[PDB]
Amino acid sequence: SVGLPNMTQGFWENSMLTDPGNVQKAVCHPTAWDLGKGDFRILMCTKVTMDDFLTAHHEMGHIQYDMAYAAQPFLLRNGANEGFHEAVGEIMSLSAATPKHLKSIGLLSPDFQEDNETEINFLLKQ
Amino acid sequence: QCVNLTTRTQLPPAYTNSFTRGVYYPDKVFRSSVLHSTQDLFLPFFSNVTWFHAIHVTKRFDNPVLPFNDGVYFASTEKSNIIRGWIFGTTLDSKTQSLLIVNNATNVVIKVCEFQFCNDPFLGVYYHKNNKSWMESEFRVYSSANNCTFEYVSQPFLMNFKNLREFVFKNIDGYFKIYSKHTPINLVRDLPQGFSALEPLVDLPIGINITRFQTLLALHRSYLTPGDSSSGWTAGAAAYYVGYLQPRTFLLKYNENGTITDAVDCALDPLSE
Amino acid sequence: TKCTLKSFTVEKGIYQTSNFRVQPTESIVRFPNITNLCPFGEVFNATRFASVYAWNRKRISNCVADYSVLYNSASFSTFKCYGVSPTKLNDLCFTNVYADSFVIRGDEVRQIAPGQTGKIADYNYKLPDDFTGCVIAWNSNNLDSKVGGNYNYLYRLFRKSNLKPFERDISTEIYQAGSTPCNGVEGFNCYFPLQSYGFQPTNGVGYQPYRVVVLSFELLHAPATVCGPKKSTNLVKNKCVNFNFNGLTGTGVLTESNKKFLPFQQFGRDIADTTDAVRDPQTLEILDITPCSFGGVSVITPGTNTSNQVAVLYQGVNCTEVPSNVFQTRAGCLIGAEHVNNSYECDIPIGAGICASYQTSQSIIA
Ligand SMILES: *[C@@H]1O[C@H](CO)[C@@H](O[C@@H]2O[C@H](CO)[C@@H](O)[C@H](O)[C@H]2NC(C)=O)[C@H](O)[C@H]1NC(C)=O
Ligand SMILES: *[C@@H]1O[C@H](CO)[C@@H](O[C@@H]2O[C@H](CO)[C@@H](O)[C@H](O)[C@H]2NC(C)=O)[C@H](O)[C@H]1NC(C)=O
Ligand SMILES: *[C@@H]1O[C@H](CO)[C@@H](O[C@@H]2O[C@H](CO)[C@@H](O)[C@H](O)[C@H]2NC(C)=O)[C@H](O)[C@H]1NC(C)=O
Ligand SMILES: *[C@@H]1O[C@H](CO)[C@@H](O)[C@H](O)[C@H]1NC(C)=O
Numbered sequence: 001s002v003g004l005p006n007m008t009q010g011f012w013e014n015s016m017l018t019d020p021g022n023v024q025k026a027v028c029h030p031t032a033w034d035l036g037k038g039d040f041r042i043l044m045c046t047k048v049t050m051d052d053f054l055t056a057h058h059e060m061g062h063i064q065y066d067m068a069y070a071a072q073p074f075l076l077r078n079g080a081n082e083g084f085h086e087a088v089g090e091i092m093s094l095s096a097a098t099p100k101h102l103k104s105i106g107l108l109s110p111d112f113q114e115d116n117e118t119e120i121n122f123l124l125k126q
Numbered sequence: 127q128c129v130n131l132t133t134r135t136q137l138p139p140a141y142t143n144s145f146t147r148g149v150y151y152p153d154k155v156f157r158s159s160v161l162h163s164t165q166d167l168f169l170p171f172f173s174n175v176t177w178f179h180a181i182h183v184t185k186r187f188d189n190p191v192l193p194f195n196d197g198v199y200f201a202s203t204e205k206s207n208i209i210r211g212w213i214f215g216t217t218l219d220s221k222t223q224s225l226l227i228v229n230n231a232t233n234v235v236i237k238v239c240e241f242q243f244c245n246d247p248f249l250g251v252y253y254h255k256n257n258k259s260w261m262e263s264e265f266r267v268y269s270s271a272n273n274c275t276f277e278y279v280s281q282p283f284l285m286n287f288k289n290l291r292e293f294v295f296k297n298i299d300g301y302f303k304i305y306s307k308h309t310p311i312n313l314v315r316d317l318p319q320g321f322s323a324l325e326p327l328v329d330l331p332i333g334i335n336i337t338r339f340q341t342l343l344a345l346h347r348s349y350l351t352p353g354d355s356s357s358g359w360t361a362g363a364a365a366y367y368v369g370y371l372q373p374r375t376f377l378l379k380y381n382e383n384g385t386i387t388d389a390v391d392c393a394l395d396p397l398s399e
Numbered sequence: 400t401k402c403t404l405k406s407f408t409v410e411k412g413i414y415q416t417s418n419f420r421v422q423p424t425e426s427i428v429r430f431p432n433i434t435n436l437c438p439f440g441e442v443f444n445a446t447r448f449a450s451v452y453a454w455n456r457k458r459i460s461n462c463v464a465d466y467s468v469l470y471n472s473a474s475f476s477t478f479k480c481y482g483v484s485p486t487k488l489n490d491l492c493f494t495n496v497y498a499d500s501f502v503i504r505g506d507e508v509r510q511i512a513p514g515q516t517g518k519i520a521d522y523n524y525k526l527p528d529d530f531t532g533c534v535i536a537w538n539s540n541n542l543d544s545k546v547g548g549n550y551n552y553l554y555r556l557f558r559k560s561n562l563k564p565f566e567r568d569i570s571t572e573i574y575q576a577g578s579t580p581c582n583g584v585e586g587f588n589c590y591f592p593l594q595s596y597g598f599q600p601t602n603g604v605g606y607q608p609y610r611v612v613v614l615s616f617e618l619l620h621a622p623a624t625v626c627g628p629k630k631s632t633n634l635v636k637n638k639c640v641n642f643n644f645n646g647l648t649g650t651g652v653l654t655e656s657n658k659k660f661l662p663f664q665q666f667g668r669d670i671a672d673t674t675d676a677v678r679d680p681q682t683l684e685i686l687d688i689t690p691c692s693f694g695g696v697s698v699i700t701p702g703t704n705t706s707n708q709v710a711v712l713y714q715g716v717n718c719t720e721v722p723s724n725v726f727q728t729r730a731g732c733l734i735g736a737e738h739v740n741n742s743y744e745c746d747i748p749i750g751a752g753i754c755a756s757y758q759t760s761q762s763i764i765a
């Protein structure tokens with residue numbers, strides 16, 4: 001809806017969106033892996049948590065940023081500096097943290113107050 | 127792969143008085159008992175047709191490279207199927223394309239490639255007394271094959287003069303029509319006197335120019351002749367004729383069933399006119 | 400009659416006004432059977448293909464190509480054509496078609512087009528600007544990809560010169576960019592021309608192997624031996640219908656014949672060069688062609704000053720084929736006259752011994 005293209009057919013069949021548990025050892029650390037040949041996949045044990053929601057948004061933003069310059073040579077398929085590659089992923093999480101977005105998606109109920117106390121608390125937490 | 131036939135005496139060519147032969151259906155249109163007149167390339171009646179005889183007593187084996195002006199009339203006065211096929215082209219080398227119609231007693235192979243034929247191409251068979259049957263010996267028509275245009279392979283089979291097979295070849299509008307009529311004969315004369323309407327067999331569009339042709343005969347290399355890489359070959363009793371076509375006007379007499387029974391060349395005598 | 404004679408009054412007698420004729424129906428068309436279309440069992444459905452530089456050049460000239468089975472198929476991704484309409488492919492003919500077959504990367508399929516350039520379009524396979532044909536490319540990542548990455552395909556990456564349209568070369572000389580001479584190995588300015596490709600099943604769009612084929616159409620002075628399928632509709636007899644058999648067209652009623660044609664004679668004719676018999680290229684049966692009925696319409700009418708009732712005569716037309724009694728005569732069908740047995744003196748000559756008159760509650764009698 002923002003304007004980013006869709007995902008590939010290999011992103012939804014190779015990513016591990018479910019923690020296997022004690023059946024096999026697997027590190028649960030969110031990292032946006034870029035294989036370089038169109039194989040984009042996220043490695044994260046995403047669960048039912050708002051923090052996990054924001055982390056998944058950050059990982060998807062990183063994947064979109066990596067796919068943005070996919071039509072470039074190997075020496076160019078990388079961020080300009082060491083700060084933009086993470087800022088492009090963090091701005092999506094900072095924008096998605098608004099309560100109006102969660103209310104429009106379906107998480108937050110329509111009946112919700114808009115007092116300034118919650119805004120001040122969120123600003124202080126940030 | 128080319129083998130030049132040695133030990134051959136040169137004899138002057140001969141001729142014969144061809145009878146009312148070389149009549150074929152010009153088109154595929156049925157007609158009733160009514161007569162018809164057409165101006166297609168036909169064979170003039172009572173014309174000089176070159177006689178090529180090849181027997182062994184000095185031995186004689188004549189198969190030169192004859193030109194192709196407007197069409198040829200080929201006849202097969204055989205008794206053991208000595209004639210194997212024909213060759214058509216303009217250079218007989220890798221320069222241009224050439225038509226090669228060869229039948230190795232198993233398949234009627236017709237290919238249109240840029241063959242580079244030899245000077246004296248032929249086919250050879252072998253006779254084994256232990257097997258009590260004949261068999262092929264070698265196939266040295268050409269050496270290699272370049273890019274082709276058309277190829278065809280018939281269904282597999284096995285194989286005095288008591289057989290006659292006529293042929294008429296033409297080349298107009300790229301198409302190469304072939305007429306044939308296999309009729310049985312029983313006589314000792316050179317060319318029988320009679321009438322036969324040749325029917326169209328194939329119309330393969332070679333799409334290439336044809337200015338010369340050559341007949342491919344068979345040879346024998348049994349134990350009667352000394353074995354040699356170039357000599358020691360013999361040929362049975364066989365002969366073929368070559369008649370050139372000319373633009374004339376005939377009067378075809380169609381039968382009530384559609385078979386041409388009689389015809390008259392309106393160029394020989396005033397009665398025909 | 401008043402309009403043909405250019406007079407408001409018509410005298411007693413028989414006059415010819417128009418000419419009756421029968422119209423055809425549905426325009427039956429016939430053609431021989433359609434068997435052994437083309438040996439497409441080794442190009443569009445093959446198992447093992449070659450590299451981009453080892454593309455095959457199989458000739459398609461002696462078989463009837465059917466482009467409807469590929470245009471209407473959903474198993475292909477791109478079916479673009481250039482210089483020819485994709486719908487009329489089965490209607491026209493050709494002379495020789497070159498069947499290409501080579502596997503290329505997903506993102507490199509766009510460069511395979513007339514008038515385009517690129518690294519692969521100029522060093523491996525180039526199309527001319529005047530190319531007249533169609534491009535076909537489908538996904539093949541499900542069978543061409545293997546575990547561990549596919550490296551069985553190679554391609555040319557650098558060379559001193561480009562490739563001409565419809566050119567194939569297997570030369571593998573080393574490229575030399577700088578002035579330093581190369582002895583046979585790589586180095587500073589020496590490189591190898593061939594490079595192994597990579598195809599993995601986990602790759603996304605743009606890197607998957609897409610089997611793209613090129614169909615070039617050429618029409619030179621050679622006879623057209625390759626065409627497309629035709630209609631070959633159904634036939635019917637005992638009706639006036641314009642027909643179109645293999646090589647000719649006509650109009651007339653067909654019927655079951657009894658003649659015995661020759662195995663090679665297809666058409667039939669007779670004196671004065673009139674087509675009267677054609678064979679069915681599917682049933683191998685002979686049909687007698689008969690021209691549909693036609694005749695000059697004659698209007699028998701008395702004097703206008705006497706009466707206005709008129710009679711119609713269809714000369715040579717049977718009464719069963721005309722569409723107030725109806726009486727059939729040897730001269731044709733007569734409509735509007737009552738047949739009587741009394742023999743009077745001939746007043747208006749009709750033909751074949753029959754005459755008309757205006758006698759007694761009052762009409763015209765034949
Ligand atoms: C059969 O005879 C022909 C005719 O002489 C030979 O063809 C010649 O081959 C030589 C090769 O040295 C050429 O220099 C000549 O120009 C050729 N002549 C012609 C007319 O083509 C052929 O080599 C002979 N074949 C064998 C096996 O002896
Ligand atoms: C030649 O290609 C055709 C493609 O049109 C193949 O036809 C397909 O065959 C498979 C299995 O045989 C079917 O599942 C498809 O539905 C067919 N496609 C059609 C009918 O459009 C055909 O099998 C190929 N021939 C060979 C020998 O491989
Ligand atoms: C051409 O027309 C049709 C097209 O399939 C076929 O006609 C068959 O002919 C055979 C022999 O004459 C009959 O036994 C069949 O009943 C006919 N119909 C079918 C559906 O097979 C056949 O292919 C051709 N007809 C010929 C050669 O007569
Ligand atoms: C045929 O050739 C012979 C010589 O072989 C000659 O005497 C005769 O006149 C020729 N006939 C014709 C019609 O040319």
Ligand SMILES: *[C@@H]1O[C@H](CO)[C@@H](O)[C@H](O)[C@H]1NC(C)=O
Pocket residue numbers: 230231232233235262
């Ligand atoms: C005749 O030649 C054809 C083509 O080379 C071949 O397929 C066939 O086996 C041959 N027949 C024989 C040698 O009897």
Ligand SMILES: *[C@@H]1O[C@H](CO)[C@@H](O)[C@H](O)[C@H]1NC(C)=O
Pocket residue numbers: 254256257260261
């Ligand atoms: C002739 O017989 C021999 C002995 O078995 C055999 O090897 C050879 O092939 C036969 N030749 C034929 C059948 O042409």
Ligand SMILES: *[C@@H]1O[C@H](CO)[C@@H](O)[C@H](O)[C@H]1NC(C)=O
Pocket residue numbers: 223273274275
């Ligand atoms: C075959 O190769 C020759 C070689 O020059 C070429 O001229 C010709 O166009 C090619 N194709 C045909 C059908 O002869």
Ligand SMILES: *[C@@H]1O[C@H](CO)[C@@H](O)[C@H](O)[C@H]1NC(C)=O
Pocket residue numbers: 333334335
């Ligand atoms: C045959 O020769 C004529 C005369 O020059 C030429 O126009 C024609 O192109 C030739 N045929 C072929 C197939 O080249």
Ligand SMILES: *[C@@H]1O[C@H](CO)[C@@H](O)[C@H](O)[C@H]1NC(C)=O
Pocket residue numbers: 381382383
């Ligand atoms: C022609 O056909 C008829 C009828 O089938 C037959 O009797 C006759 O023998 C055939 N041949 C000739 C020459 O009439």
Ligand SMILES: *[C@@H]1O[C@H](CO)[C@@H](O)[C@H](O)[C@H]1NC(C)=O
Pocket residue numbers: 717718719728729
């Ligand atoms: C008209 O058709 C009928 C019906 O078959 C027939 O009996 C009659 O002879 C035909 N008359 C003419 C003149 O054709």
Ligand SMILES: *[C@@H]1O[C@H](CO)[C@@H](O)[C@H](O)[C@H]1NC(C)=O
Pocket residue numbers: 738739740
């Ligand atoms: C004319 O004569 C025929 C033959 O007997 C008869 O059927 C018909 O009824 C007669 N018509 C009149 C009007 O008498």
